[PDB]
Short mmCIF file of C-alpha atoms and ligand atoms in Angstrom, two decimals:
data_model
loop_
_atom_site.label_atom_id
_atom_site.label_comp_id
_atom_site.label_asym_id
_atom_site.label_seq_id
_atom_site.Cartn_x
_atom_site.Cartn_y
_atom_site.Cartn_z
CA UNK A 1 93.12 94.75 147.63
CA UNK A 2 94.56 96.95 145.29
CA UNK A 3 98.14 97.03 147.45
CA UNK A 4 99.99 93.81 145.71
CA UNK A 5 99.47 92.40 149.59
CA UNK A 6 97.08 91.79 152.21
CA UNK B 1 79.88 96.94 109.14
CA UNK B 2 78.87 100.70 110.53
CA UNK B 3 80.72 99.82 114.04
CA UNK B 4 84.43 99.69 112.23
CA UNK B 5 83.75 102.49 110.09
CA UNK B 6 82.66 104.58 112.95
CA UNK B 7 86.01 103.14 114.67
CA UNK B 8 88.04 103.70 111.17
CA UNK B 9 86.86 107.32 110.94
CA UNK B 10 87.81 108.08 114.46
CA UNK B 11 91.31 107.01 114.66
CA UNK B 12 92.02 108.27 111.39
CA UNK B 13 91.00 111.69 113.19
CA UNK B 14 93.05 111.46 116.41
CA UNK B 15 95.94 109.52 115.20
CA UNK B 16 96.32 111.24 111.67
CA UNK B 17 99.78 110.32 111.24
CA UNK B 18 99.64 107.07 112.21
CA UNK B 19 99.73 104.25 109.08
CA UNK B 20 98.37 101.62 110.86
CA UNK B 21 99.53 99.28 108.04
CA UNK B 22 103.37 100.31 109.97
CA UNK B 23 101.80 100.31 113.46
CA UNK B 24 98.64 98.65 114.00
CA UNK B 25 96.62 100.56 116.67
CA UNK B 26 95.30 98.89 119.74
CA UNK B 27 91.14 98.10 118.68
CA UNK B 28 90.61 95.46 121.33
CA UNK B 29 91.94 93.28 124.24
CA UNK B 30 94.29 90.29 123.21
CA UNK B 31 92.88 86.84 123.31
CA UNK B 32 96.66 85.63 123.82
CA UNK B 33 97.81 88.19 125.78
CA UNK B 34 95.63 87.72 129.23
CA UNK B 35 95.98 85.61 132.40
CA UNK B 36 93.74 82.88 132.29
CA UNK B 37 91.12 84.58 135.16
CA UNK B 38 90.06 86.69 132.45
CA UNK B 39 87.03 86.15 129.82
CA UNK B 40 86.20 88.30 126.49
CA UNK B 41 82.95 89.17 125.49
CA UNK B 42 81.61 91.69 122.55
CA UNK B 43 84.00 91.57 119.97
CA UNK B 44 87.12 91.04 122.32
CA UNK B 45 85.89 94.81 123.84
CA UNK B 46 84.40 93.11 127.31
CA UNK B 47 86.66 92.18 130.27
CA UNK B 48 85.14 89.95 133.10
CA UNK B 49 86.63 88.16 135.62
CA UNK B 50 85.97 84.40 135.41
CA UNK B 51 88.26 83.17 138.68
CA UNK B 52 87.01 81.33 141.33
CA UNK B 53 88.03 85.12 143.81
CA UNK B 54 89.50 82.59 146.75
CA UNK B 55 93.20 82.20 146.03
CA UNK B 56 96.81 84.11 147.66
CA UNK B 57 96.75 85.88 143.90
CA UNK B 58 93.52 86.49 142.00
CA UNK B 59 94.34 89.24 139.94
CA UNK B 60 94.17 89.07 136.45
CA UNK B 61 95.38 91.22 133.51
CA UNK B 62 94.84 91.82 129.42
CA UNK B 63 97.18 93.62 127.13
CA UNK B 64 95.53 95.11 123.99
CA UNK B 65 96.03 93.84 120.80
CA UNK B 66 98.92 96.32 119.90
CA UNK B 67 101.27 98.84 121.82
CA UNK B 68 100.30 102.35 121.32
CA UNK B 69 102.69 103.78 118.48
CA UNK B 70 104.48 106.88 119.47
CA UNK B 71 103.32 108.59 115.78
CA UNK B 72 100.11 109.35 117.83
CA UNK B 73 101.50 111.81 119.66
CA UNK B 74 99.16 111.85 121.99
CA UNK B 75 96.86 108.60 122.76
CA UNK B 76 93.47 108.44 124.35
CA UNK B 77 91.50 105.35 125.38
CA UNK B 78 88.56 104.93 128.18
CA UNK B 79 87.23 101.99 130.30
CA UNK B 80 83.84 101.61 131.41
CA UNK B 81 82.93 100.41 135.03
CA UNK B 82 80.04 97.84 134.20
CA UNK B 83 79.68 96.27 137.08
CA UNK B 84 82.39 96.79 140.16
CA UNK B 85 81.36 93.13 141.00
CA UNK B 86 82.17 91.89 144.83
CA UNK B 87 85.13 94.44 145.91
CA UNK B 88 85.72 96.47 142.45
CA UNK B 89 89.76 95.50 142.69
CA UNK B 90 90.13 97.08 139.44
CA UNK B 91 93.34 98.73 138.07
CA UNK B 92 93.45 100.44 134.55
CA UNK B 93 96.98 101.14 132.71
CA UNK B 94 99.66 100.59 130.60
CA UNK B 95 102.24 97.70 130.56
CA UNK B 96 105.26 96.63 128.30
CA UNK B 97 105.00 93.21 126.60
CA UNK B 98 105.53 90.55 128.50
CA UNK B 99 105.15 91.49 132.04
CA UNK B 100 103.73 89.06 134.22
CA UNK B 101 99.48 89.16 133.82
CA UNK B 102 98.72 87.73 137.68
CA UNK B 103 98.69 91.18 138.86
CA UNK B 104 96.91 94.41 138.84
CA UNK B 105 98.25 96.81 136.08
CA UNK B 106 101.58 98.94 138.09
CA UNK B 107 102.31 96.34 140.81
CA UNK B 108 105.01 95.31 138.39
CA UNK B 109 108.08 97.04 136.66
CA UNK B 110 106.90 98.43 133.65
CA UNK B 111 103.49 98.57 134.46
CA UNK B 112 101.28 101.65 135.34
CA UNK B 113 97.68 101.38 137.34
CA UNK B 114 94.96 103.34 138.43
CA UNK B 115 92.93 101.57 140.96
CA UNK B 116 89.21 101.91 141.61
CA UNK B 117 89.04 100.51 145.29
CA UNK B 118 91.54 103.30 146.50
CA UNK B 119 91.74 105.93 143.77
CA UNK B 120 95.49 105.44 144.24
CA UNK B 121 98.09 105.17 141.52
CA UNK B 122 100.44 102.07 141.10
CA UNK B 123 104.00 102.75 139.49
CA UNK B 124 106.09 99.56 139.41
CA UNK B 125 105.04 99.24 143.08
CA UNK B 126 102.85 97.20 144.76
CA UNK B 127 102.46 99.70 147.37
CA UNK B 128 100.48 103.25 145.94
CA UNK B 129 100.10 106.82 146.37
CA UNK B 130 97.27 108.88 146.42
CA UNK B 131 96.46 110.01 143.18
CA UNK B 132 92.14 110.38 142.48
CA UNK B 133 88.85 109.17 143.27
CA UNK B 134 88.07 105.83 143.52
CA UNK B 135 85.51 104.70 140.74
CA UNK B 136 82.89 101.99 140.81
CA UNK B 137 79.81 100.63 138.36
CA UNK B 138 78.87 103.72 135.92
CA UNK B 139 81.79 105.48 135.93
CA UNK B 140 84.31 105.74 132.69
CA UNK B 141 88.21 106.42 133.42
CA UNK B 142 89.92 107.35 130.81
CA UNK B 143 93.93 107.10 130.43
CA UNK B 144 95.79 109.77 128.15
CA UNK B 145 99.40 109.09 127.16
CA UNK B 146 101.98 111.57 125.52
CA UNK B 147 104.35 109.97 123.79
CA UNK B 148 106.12 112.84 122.97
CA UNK B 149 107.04 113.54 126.87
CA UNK B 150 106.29 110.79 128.19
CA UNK B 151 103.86 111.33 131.00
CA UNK B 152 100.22 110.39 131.49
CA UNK B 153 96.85 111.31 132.69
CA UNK B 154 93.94 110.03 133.68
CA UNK B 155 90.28 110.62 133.51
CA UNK B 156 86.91 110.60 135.17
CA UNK B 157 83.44 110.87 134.07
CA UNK B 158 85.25 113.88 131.64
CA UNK B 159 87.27 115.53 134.04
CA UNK B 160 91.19 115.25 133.90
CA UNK B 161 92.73 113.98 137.29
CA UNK B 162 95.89 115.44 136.32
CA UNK B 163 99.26 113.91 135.57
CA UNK B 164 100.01 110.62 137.29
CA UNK B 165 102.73 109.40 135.49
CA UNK B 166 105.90 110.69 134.14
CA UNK B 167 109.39 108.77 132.37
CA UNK B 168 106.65 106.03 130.66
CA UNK B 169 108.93 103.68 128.77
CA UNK B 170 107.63 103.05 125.00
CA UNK B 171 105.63 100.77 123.68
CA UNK B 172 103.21 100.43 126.40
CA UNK B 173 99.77 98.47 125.74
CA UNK B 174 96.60 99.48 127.12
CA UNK B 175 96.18 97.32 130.06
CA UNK B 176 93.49 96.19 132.41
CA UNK B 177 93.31 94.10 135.57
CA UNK B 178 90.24 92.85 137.79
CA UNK B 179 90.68 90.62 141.05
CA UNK B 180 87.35 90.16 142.52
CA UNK B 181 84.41 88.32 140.46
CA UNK B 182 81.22 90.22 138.95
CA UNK B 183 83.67 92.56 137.37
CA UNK B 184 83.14 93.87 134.18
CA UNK B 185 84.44 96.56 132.41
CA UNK B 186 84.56 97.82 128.81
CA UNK B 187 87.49 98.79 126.24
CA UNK B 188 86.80 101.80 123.99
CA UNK B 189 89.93 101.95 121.91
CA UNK B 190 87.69 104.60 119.49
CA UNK B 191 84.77 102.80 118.48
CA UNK B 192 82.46 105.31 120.14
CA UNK B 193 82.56 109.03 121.32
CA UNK B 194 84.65 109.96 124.48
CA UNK B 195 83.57 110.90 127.30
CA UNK B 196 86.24 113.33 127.94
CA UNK B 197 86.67 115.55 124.95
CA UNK B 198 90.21 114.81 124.07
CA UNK B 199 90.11 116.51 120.76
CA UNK B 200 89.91 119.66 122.76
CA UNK B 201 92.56 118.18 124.96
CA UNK B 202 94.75 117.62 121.89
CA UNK B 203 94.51 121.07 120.37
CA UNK B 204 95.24 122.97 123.38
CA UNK B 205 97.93 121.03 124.34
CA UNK B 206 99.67 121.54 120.40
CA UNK B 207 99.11 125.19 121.04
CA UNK B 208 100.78 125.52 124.54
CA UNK B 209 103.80 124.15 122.92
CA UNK C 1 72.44 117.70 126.48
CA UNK C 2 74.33 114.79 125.15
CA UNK C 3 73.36 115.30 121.34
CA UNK C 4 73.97 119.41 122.06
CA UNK C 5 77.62 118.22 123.05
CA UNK C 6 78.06 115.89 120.34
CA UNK C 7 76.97 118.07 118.00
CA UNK C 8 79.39 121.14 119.30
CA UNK C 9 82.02 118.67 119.03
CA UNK C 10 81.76 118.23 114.92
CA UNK C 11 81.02 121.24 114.54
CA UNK C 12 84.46 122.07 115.77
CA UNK C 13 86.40 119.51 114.20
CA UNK C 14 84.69 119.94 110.74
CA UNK C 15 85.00 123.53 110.62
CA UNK C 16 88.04 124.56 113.18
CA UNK C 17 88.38 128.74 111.63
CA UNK C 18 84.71 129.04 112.44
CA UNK C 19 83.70 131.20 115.42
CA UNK C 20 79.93 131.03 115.94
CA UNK C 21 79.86 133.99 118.04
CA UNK C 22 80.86 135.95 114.79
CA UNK C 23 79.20 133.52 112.99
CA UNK C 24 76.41 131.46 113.72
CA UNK C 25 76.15 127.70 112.38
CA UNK C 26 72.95 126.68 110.93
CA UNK C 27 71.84 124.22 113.54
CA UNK C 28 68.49 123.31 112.89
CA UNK C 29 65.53 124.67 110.33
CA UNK C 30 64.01 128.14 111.10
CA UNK C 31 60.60 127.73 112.59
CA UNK C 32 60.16 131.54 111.21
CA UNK C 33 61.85 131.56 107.82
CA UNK C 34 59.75 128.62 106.01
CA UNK C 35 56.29 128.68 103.91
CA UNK C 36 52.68 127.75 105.91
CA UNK C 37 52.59 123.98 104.09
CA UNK C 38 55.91 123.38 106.11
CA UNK C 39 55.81 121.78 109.46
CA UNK C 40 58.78 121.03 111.71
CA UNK C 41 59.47 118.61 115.09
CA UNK C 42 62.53 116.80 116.85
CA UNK C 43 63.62 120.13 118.03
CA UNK C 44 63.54 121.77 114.32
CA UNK C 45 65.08 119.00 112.46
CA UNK C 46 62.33 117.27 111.50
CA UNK C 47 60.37 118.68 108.18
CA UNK C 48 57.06 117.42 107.31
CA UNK C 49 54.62 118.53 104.17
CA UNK C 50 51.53 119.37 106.05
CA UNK C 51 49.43 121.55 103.47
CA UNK C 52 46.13 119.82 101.83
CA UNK C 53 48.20 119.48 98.54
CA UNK C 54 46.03 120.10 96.02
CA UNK C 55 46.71 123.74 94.97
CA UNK C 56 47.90 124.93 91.44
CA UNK C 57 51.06 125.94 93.94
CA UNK C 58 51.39 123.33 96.42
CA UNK C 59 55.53 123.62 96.61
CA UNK C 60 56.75 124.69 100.01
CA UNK C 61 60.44 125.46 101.41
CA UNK C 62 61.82 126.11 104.61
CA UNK C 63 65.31 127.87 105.54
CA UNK C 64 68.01 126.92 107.64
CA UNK C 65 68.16 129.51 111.12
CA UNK C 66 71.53 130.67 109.66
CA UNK C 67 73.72 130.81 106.48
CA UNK C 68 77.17 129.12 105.74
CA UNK C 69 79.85 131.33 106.57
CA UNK C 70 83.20 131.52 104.56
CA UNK C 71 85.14 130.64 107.24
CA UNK C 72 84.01 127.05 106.83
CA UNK C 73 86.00 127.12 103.80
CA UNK C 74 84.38 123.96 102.86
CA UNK C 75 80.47 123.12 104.63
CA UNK C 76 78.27 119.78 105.12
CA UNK C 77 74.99 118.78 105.45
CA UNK C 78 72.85 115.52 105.02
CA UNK C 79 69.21 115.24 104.40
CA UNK C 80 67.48 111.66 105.38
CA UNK C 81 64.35 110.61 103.43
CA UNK C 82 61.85 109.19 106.63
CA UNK C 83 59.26 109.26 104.26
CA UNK C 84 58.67 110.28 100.17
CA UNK C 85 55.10 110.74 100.67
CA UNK C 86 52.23 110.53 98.37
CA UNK C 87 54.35 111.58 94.88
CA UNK C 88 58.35 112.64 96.79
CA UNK C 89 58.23 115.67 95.41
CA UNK C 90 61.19 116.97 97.31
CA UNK C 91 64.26 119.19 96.93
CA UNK C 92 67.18 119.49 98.57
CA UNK C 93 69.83 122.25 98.13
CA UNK C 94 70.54 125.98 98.79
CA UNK C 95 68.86 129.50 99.17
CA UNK C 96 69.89 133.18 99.31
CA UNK C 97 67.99 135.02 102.20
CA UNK C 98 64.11 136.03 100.75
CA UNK C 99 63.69 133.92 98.28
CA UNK C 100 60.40 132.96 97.31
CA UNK C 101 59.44 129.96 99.89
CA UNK C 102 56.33 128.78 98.10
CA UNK C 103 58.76 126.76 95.70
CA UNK C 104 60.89 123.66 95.84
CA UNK C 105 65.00 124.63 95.61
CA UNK C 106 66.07 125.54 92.52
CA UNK C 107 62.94 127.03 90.53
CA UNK C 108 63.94 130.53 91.39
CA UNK C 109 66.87 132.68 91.39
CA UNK C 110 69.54 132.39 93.87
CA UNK C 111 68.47 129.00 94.68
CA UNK C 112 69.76 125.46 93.94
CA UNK C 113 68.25 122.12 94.22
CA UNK C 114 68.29 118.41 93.32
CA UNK C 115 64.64 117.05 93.43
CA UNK C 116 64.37 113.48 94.52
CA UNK C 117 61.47 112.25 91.98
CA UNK C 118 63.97 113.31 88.81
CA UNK C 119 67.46 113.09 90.20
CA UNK C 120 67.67 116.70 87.89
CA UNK C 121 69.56 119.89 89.30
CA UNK C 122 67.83 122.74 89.51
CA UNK C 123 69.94 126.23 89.43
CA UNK C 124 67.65 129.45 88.93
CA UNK C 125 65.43 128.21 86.56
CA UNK C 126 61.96 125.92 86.64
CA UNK C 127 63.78 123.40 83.90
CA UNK C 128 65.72 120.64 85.72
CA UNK C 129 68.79 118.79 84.14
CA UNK C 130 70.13 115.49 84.09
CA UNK C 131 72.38 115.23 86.73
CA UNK C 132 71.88 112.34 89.82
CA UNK C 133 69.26 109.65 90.53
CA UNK C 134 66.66 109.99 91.71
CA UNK C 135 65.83 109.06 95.71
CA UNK C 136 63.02 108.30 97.89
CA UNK C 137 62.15 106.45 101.31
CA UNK C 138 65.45 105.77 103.16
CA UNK C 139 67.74 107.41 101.12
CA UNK C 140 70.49 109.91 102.71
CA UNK C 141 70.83 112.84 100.39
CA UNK C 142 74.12 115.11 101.20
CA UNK C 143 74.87 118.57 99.66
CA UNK C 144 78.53 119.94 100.12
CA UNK C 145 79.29 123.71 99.52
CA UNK C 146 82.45 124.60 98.28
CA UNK C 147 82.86 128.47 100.13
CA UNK C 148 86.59 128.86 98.36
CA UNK C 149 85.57 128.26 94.82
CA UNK C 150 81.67 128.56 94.97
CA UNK C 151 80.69 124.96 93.79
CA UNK C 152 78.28 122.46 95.10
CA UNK C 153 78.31 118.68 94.63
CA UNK C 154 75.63 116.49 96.11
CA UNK C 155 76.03 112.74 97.77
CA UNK C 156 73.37 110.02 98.01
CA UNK C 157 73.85 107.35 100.66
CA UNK C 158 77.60 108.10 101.00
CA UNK C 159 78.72 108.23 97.13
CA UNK C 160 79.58 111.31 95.89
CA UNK C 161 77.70 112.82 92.74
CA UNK C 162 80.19 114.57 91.24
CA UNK C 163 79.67 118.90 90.82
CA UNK C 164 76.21 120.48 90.36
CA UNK C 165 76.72 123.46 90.65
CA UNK C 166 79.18 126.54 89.93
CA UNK C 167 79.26 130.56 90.68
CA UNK C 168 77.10 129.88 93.80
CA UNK C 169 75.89 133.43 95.38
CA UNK C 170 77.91 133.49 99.35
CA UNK C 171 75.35 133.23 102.61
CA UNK C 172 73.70 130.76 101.31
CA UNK C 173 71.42 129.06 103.67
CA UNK C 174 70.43 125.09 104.03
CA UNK C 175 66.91 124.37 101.99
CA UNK C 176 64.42 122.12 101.36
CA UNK C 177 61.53 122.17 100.08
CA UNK C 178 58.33 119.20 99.50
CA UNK C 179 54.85 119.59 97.58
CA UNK C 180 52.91 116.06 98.48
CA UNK C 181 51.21 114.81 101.67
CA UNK C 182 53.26 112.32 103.70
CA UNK C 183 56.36 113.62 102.75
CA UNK C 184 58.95 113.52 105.85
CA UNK C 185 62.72 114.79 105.82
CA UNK C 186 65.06 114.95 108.40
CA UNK C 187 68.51 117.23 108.70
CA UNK C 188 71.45 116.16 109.95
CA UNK C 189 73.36 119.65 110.47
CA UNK C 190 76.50 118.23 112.42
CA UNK C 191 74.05 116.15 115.00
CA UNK C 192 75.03 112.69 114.15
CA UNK C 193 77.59 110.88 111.92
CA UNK C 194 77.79 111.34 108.34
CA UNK C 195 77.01 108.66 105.79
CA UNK C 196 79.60 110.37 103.79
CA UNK C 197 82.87 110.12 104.75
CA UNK C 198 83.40 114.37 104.83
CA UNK C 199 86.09 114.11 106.70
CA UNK C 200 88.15 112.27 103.92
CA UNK C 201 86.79 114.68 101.59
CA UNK C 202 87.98 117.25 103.20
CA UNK C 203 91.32 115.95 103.88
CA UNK C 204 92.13 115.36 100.00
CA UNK C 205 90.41 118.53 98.76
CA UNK C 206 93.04 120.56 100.84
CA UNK C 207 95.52 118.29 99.71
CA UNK C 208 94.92 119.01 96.00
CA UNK C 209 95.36 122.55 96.08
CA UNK D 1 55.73 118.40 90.07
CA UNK D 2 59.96 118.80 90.37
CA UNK D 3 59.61 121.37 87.20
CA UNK D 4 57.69 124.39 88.33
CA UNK D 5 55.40 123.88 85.11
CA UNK D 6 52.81 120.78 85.43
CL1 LIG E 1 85.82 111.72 118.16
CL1 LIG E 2 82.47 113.59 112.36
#
């Protein structure tokens, strides 16, 4: 997403 | 040509005591300085994102050309959604030279992101805090730094969002990074009007202090 | 809405001490204070010859909605030649309130002109002098009023023309004036870009003193 | 003409 991970 | 002079004109109006011929100012993304899921279009001004969007890390970053010189005092540029493409995984930002371009601008140390899909802000952290909107195709998000204190705002269709950064290090380049393809988004550095009037910005700000 | 902000915008960077609600910019031509053989369009900006044209006293002017305050300290306007008509009988310059609109700039007291068919200056008097080139179809004509020391030079597609006039009269408003069929002018008050770099201008002027 | 005189 934008978050560095799923 | 009648684009630069427009462009000349403009940053000799912001950034009046900046010699650019001491500090170059950022007037497009870096041909060098992007991850290799990125393409340039119109005059190095274009972003799209040219990955195949099926791997464990998609994302993709560009530096501008320059970092912004602190004799600006304050520094203004804005990014154009074009298109938000498949999931609009778009961060816009700052980052120092040399930070690693297979992210989204602020997962990393020294990098600084505002992120479309969540309207969250990214400070050396790849997990966010609330901080706007989220933006999509149409919208322009602009990103104001002061390099006199430091901090930084951002922009939306004209309206300030309000400080999201403070204790930016220097030299920071205009940054952008798209995951998903169909992406596009446009740089203006100066070469047109803004849509957030950041002239008014500037000359309130040098009279509250 | 777009071109209103625009427009607001240069009008506050290029003349900052002004406050239009003490002092009105000129923004546009008067649709009251200009002779019969004048028509205007393009919300006022627009100035077309539209008398038969074949009178002993064909000349016709038209007025600016406001004159130049002081405050500007030093003013700007550009004049774009759409069309020089049947002969381009046309002036361009300045006017004191009243004068005589059934004229072309310059023939009568109180008001200055440089015709386009002569390139002469005309400064209270019906006998031109040497002073520019002349200019026709496509041409940009600018005329820059001095409001410290009361000169006037005027520009043609962004070169400067050196001084025309000296001892101008203050509240002087924006003028021009045609005489032929087919003749088309438009005014850029602050609207769009200038072809001359004013800005630049301005910046050394102020310097020099 | 540009002169007021013909
Ligand atoms: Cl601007
Ligand atoms: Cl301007």
């Amino acid at each position: 997403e934008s978050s560095d991970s799923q | 040509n009648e684009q630069e002079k427009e462009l000349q004109r403009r940053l000799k109006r912001l950034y009046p005591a900046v010699d650019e011929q001491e500090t170059p100012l950022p007037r497009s993304w870096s041909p060098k300085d992007k991850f290799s899921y990125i393409g340039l279009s119109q005059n190095n001004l274009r972003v799209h994102y040219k990955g195949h969007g099926k791997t464990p890390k998609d994302a993709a970053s560009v530096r501008a050309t320059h970092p912004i010189p602190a004799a600006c005092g304050i520094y203004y540029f804005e990014v154009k959604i074009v298109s938000k493409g498949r999931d609009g995984y778009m961060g816009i930002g700052l980052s120092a030279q040399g930070v690693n371009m297979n992210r989204l601008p602020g997962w990393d140390k020294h990098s600084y992101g505002y992120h479309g899909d969540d309207g969250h802000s990214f400070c050396s952290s790849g997990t966010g805090q609330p901080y706007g909107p989220t933006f999509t195709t149409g919208d322009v998000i602009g990103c104001c730094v002061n390099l006199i204190n430091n901090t930084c705002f951002y922009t939306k269709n004209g309206h300030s969002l309000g400080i999201a950064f403070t204790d930016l290090p220097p030299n920071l380049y205009p940054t952008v990074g798209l995951q998903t393809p169909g992406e596009v988004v446009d740089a203006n550095f100066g070469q047109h009007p803004f849509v957030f009037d950041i002239e008014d910005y500037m000359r309130e700000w040098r009279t509250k202090i």
